[PDB]
Write a protein that holds these residues in place. Structure first.
Motif, PDB file in Angstrom:
ATOM      1  N   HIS A 100       3.485   4.535   2.707  1.00 55.13           N
ATOM      2  CA  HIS A 100       4.588   2.997   1.746  1.00 55.13           C
ATOM      3  C   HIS A 100       4.069   1.348   2.534  1.00 55.13           C
ATOM      4  CE1 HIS A 100       7.325   6.742   1.853  1.00 55.13           C
ATOM      5  NE2 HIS A 100       6.536   6.685   1.091  1.00 55.13           N
ATOM      6  N   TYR A 129       6.045  -2.424   3.237  1.00 53.93           N
ATOM      7  CA  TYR A 129       7.315  -3.131   3.680  1.00 53.93           C
ATOM      8  C   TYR A 129       6.756  -4.364   3.381  1.00 53.93           C
ATOM      9  CZ  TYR A 129       9.622   1.647   4.322  1.00 53.93           C
ATOM     10  OH  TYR A 129      10.174   2.926   3.337  1.00 53.93           O
ATOM     11  N   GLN A 152       8.171  -7.647   4.651  1.00 57.17           N
ATOM     12  CA  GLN A 152       9.306  -8.398   5.657  1.00 57.17           C
ATOM     13  C   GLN A 152       9.308 -10.145   6.008  1.00 57.17           C
ATOM     14  OE1 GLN A 152       9.558  -7.191  10.001  1.00 57.17           O
ATOM     15  NE2 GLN A 152      11.835  -6.825   9.684  1.00 57.17           N
ATOM     16  N   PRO A 186      15.515  -7.713   7.382  1.00 53.86           N
ATOM     17  CA  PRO A 186      15.418  -6.616   7.654  1.00 53.86           C
ATOM     18  C   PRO A 186      14.070  -5.865   6.202  1.00 53.86           C
ATOM     19  CG  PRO A 186      16.763  -6.580   5.883  1.00 53.86           C
ATOM     20  CD  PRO A 186      16.954  -7.883   6.616  1.00 53.86           C
ATOM     21  N   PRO A 187      13.006  -5.520   7.155  1.00 55.97           N
ATOM     22  CA  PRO A 187      12.562  -4.814   5.830  1.00 55.97           C
ATOM     23  C   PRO A 187      12.618  -4.250   4.435  1.00 55.97           C
ATOM     24  CG  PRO A 187      11.916  -3.270   8.507  1.00 55.97           C
ATOM     25  CD  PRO A 187      13.267  -4.182   8.361  1.00 55.97           C
ATOM     26  N   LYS A 188      11.829  -4.762   3.134  1.00 60.72           N
ATOM     27  CA  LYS A 188      12.298  -4.803   2.169  1.00 60.72           C
ATOM     28  C   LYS A 188      10.926  -3.637   1.419  1.00 60.72           C
ATOM     29  CE  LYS A 188      12.430  -6.913  -2.571  1.00 60.72           C
ATOM     30  NZ  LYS A 188      13.722  -6.095  -3.348  1.00 60.72           N
ATOM     31  N   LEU A 189      11.656  -2.789   1.061  1.00 58.83           N
ATOM     32  CA  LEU A 189      10.400  -2.268  -0.188  1.00 58.83           C
ATOM     33  C   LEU A 189       9.909  -2.283  -0.607  1.00 58.83           C
ATOM     34  CD1 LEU A 189       9.148   0.540   0.739  1.00 58.83           C
ATOM     35  CD2 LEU A 189      10.864   1.822  -1.048  1.00 58.83           C
ATOM     36  N   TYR A 195       6.310   2.680  -2.233  1.00 61.35           N
ATOM     37  CA  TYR A 195       6.687   4.027  -2.228  1.00 61.35           C
ATOM     38  C   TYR A 195       5.750   4.443  -2.801  1.00 61.35           C
ATOM     39  CZ  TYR A 195       8.308   5.260  -6.044  1.00 61.35           C
ATOM     40  OH  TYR A 195       9.018   5.604  -7.712  1.00 61.35           O
ATOM     41  N   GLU A 252       8.671  -0.377  -6.055  1.00 63.66           N
ATOM     42  CA  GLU A 252       9.930  -0.040  -6.222  1.00 63.66           C
ATOM     43  C   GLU A 252      10.773  -1.036  -7.196  1.00 63.66           C
ATOM     44  OE1 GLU A 252      14.279   1.071  -4.287  1.00 63.66           O
ATOM     45  OE2 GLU A 252      12.136   1.966  -5.194  1.00 63.66           O
ATOM     46  N   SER A 253      11.966  -0.615  -7.448  1.00 64.87           N
ATOM     47  CA  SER A 253      13.012  -1.062  -8.867  1.00 64.87           C
ATOM     48  C   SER A 253      12.678  -2.897  -8.683  1.00 64.87           C
ATOM     49  CB  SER A 253      13.882  -0.742  -9.150  1.00 64.87           C
ATOM     50  OG  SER A 253      13.639   0.247  -9.411  1.00 64.87           O
ATOM     51  N   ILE A 259      10.238  -5.419  -7.603  1.00 68.55           N
ATOM     52  CA  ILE A 259       9.313  -6.039  -7.815  1.00 68.55           C
ATOM     53  C   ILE A 259       8.229  -5.509  -8.728  1.00 68.55           C
ATOM     54  CG2 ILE A 259       7.541  -5.466  -5.739  1.00 68.55           C
ATOM     55  CD1 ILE A 259       9.705  -5.121  -4.855  1.00 68.55           C
ATOM     56  N   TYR A 267       4.150  -4.270   6.785  1.00 72.33           N
ATOM     57  CA  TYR A 267       3.859  -2.723   7.080  1.00 72.33           C
ATOM     58  C   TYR A 267       3.991  -2.041   5.866  1.00 72.33           C
ATOM     59  CZ  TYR A 267       6.169  -6.141  10.696  1.00 72.33           C
ATOM     60  OH  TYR A 267       6.595  -6.938  11.604  1.00 72.33           O
ATOM     61  N   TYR A 290      17.940  -1.524  12.815  1.00 70.40           N
ATOM     62  CA  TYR A 290      18.205  -1.238  12.568  1.00 70.40           C
ATOM     63  C   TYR A 290      18.219   0.489  12.035  1.00 70.40           C
ATOM     64  CZ  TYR A 290      15.449  -5.723  11.651  1.00 70.40           C
ATOM     65  OH  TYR A 290      14.734  -6.621  11.381  1.00 70.40           O
ATOM     66  N   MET A 318      11.726   3.852   2.438  1.00 75.81           N
ATOM     67  CA  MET A 318      13.690   3.366   3.223  1.00 75.81           C
ATOM     68  C   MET A 318      13.717   2.570   2.750  1.00 75.81           C
ATOM     69  SD  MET A 318      13.019   4.484   7.091  1.00 75.81           S
ATOM     70  CE  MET A 318      12.949   5.450   7.768  1.00 75.81           C
ATOM     71  N   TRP A 363      17.915  -0.615   3.801  1.00 71.46           N
ATOM     72  CA  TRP A 363      18.131  -1.221   5.541  1.00 71.46           C
ATOM     73  C   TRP A 363      19.978  -2.063   6.198  1.00 71.46           C
ATOM     74  CZ3 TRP A 363      14.013  -0.740   8.753  1.00 71.46           C
ATOM     75  CH2 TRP A 363      12.966  -0.021   8.186  1.00 71.46           C
TER      76      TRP A 363
END
Lengths: 240, 240
Positions: free
Chosen positions: A38, A40, A42, A47-50, A53, A59-60, A62, A91, B214, B227, B230
């Motif tokens: 996956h 991410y 950041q 926080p890290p945002k997906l 995946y 991801e919705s 994006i 990441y 987190y 994930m 978060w």
């Protein structure tokens, strides 16, 4: 476990250009075709945002400018084009087996330069005004986060309890402006590339001009898909 | 010009019900199968906020309960289910040709609804912690929008300017916790079914414990593919 190594560590790309980072896993994180890897994004102090995946599924929310590809141990994340709020660290994580590992991450920064500040585009409209009939205003809107030459600056009008009405735009790169016919010799738009500022001059006012005026970048390397970025709008009231 | 017409002028809907508004163009806004119609939400005092671009593309950061729809000249915006945060005015804009016209806008507002209940999935973690080496802190993670009882609650550690470390997980439905070996006699994950919160506990702290932590529901009925959610990140520091 499965160690993920990303490269480059630091990456800087000009705005509107293509970025490319890879993620190499020691073992194969692939399972029956699906790569359990996956990506991410950041943002500074966040926080890290997906984003993606399983190697390639966005991801919705994006946008498709984010491409996820790779096979069994070699993955690539692509951003084309790169936009202003892309400054962040990407990441990769593998969920094929635990311990679930993350990668070193690629720190992406825009060549627009600046050791400080990470994207977060904003627009500053001049203060609210109180004019009278016959008056004339010259509103400003300073831009930060992106160079105004990399796009078109738009001005929109909005009367108390009414829909928005495009006024016109201006290209700071070469000075060309364009207006809705009804606003040709009433409003005149300009921009100072030295100060990265957008101006909107409205002459010989009328009570028909009472409204909130917004500035919004949109056209090339900044918001060519709609108006995602809006200035807070400076209010102008024409009371006789 | 291309005239856009929104409808109804306004409607009222009970929380949790379906809401749908249209925007019809007097002329096509399609270009090779692509509808260049956009949707923006606007609340009193704030500028327009992009929701949907190009007929049906969910803008990064907008809730999934928003759907864009239509082709050529008839377009619909669908909000399902309606949340109270949704009371506002929605506009449609077309960028098929200049001038970039806007519609009259539709006003949605909650009507007396004997229901609702649909809070998004949110993770709320305790405040920043500053302690002495040797001390043992305890971070908290309070969920809402889902019961931590139907998934695994995970903790991730991210030291100052560095990668992310999956520490471990716990199954709130039986206390079943799993930790990365390197975190066995230092980390402890616990969770109260009723409080609907998970706790991370680190003992005999150290300089190398100074890090942001987190929590993330990953697995089963919450985020079984990666994930996606978060917590904000509990910043922990140790100087003395």
């Amino acid at each position: 476990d499965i160690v993920l190594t990303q490269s480059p560590a630091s990456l800087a790309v000009s705005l509107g250009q293509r970025a490319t980072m890879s993620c190499r896993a020691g073992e194969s994180v692939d399972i029956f075709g699906v790569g359990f890897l996956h990506w991410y994004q950041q943002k500074p102090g966040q926080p890290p945002k997906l984003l993606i995946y399983r190697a390639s599924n966005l991801e919705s929310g994006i946008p498709v400018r984010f491409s996820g590809t790779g096979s069994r141990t070699d993955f690539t994340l692509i951003i084309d084009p790169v936009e202003a709020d892309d400054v962040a660290t990407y990441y990769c994580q593998q969920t094929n087996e635990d311990p679930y590992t993350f990668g070193g991450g690629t720190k992406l920064e825009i060549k627009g330069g600046g050791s400080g500040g990470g994207g977060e585009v904003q627009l500053q409209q001049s203060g609210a005004e109180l004019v009278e009939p016959g008056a004339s205003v010259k509103l400003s809107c300073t831009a930060s986060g992106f160079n105004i030459k990399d796009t078109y600056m738009h001005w929109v009008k909005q009367r108390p309890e009414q829909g928005l009405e495009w006024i016109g735009r201006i290209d700071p790169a070469n000075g060309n402006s364009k207006y809705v016919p009804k606003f040709q010799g009433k409003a005149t738009i300009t921009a100072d590339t030295s100060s990265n500022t957008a101006y909107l001059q409205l002459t010989s006012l009328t009570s028909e001009d009472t409204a909130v005026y917004y500035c919004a970048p949109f056209g090339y390397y900044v918001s060519d898909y709609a108006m995602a970025y809006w200035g807070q709008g400076t209010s102008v009231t024409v009371s006789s």
